[PDB]
């Protein structure tokens, strides 16, 4: 029910090894405009 | 004045030996081999580095017991499952897998450290009269007893 001992800095930081986010798909809109998300459509700010 | 020689890894020279376990008593061969796996028979013996030599035991199916040890010298192996205790006599363990018989007897005479584990990895037991390591050019040793 309750923690018996406090958690140290090193154990807390080991537990957060996998707690991250990843970079998205990001294909480039060739005809006009900047990057867009892949398999998506950007009617404005992109020709694709 | 502190002047005592310590061995490095750039100092040590390990050589190769061949022991014949034919007509020898287990245990009495094992302690003498264990002293060689560690550098105990050497000057320049240093306890925090490995300074011993490689050994090869060849026949190892001709090893001997004295008493009635071949029928009641059980070994006993638990497996961490409830009621999971297993068993084999010394007589049937040298009939099948005589190499594990001698290897286990010698490793039980080495320390259980990170260095004892590495020193026990120089043992190379075989059953029969031939071995593959002719390229290392091993000598015979002739136990003292």
């Amino acid at each position: 029910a309750v923690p018996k001992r406090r958690t140290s800095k090193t154990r807390k930081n080991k537990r957060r090894t996998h707690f991250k986010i990843s970079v998205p798909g990001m294909t480039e809109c060739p005809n006009c405009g900047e990057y867009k998300l892949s398999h998506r459509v950007c009617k404005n700010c992109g020709s694709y | 004045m502190r002047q005592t020689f310590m061995a490095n890894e750039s100092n040590i020279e390990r050589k190769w030996y061949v022991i014949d376990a034919e007509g020898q008593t287990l245990g009495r061969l094992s302690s003498e081999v264990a002293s060689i796996l560690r550098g105990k028979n050497k000057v320049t013996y240093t306890p925090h580095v490995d300074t011993g030599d490689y050994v090869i035991v060849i026949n190892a199916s001709k090893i001997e017991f004295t008493g009635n040890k071949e029928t009641d010298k059980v070994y006993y192996r638990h497996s961490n499952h409830p009621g999971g205790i297993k068993s084999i006599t010394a007589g049937e363990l040298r009939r099948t897998n005589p190499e594990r018989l001698i290897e286990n007897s010698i490793k039980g005479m080495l320390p259980s450290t990170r260095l004892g584990e590495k020193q026990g990895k120089k043992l190379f037991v075989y059953g029969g009269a031939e071995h593959p390591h002719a390229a290392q050019q091993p000598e015979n040793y002739e136990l003292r007893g």
Partner: protein
Amino acid sequence: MEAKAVARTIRIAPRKVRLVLDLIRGKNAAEAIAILKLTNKASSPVIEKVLMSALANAEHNYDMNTDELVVKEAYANEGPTLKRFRPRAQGRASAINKRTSHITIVVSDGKE
């Protein structure tokens, strides 16, 4: 040279900002702008405004060419906390921390 920009006392918690900020550290500016437009966390637009501000400082004050710039440093420090309460059952109160952040971006061209 180097140009920097700071956003002080942003009202998002630092643990949440650092998570997006670990995506753009050590990348060239155009790629970092692309990444910040497609990530869908709450702190993406704020970080993007800080990065834009640094790029504009790099060009108006130090006459650097924005075509070849990399995000040299990106980090978030803690600001002062606002302390609040929430009423719980049986007449008890519990604490709530509304945390804030200082956000710093510095860009460089890699020369001297």
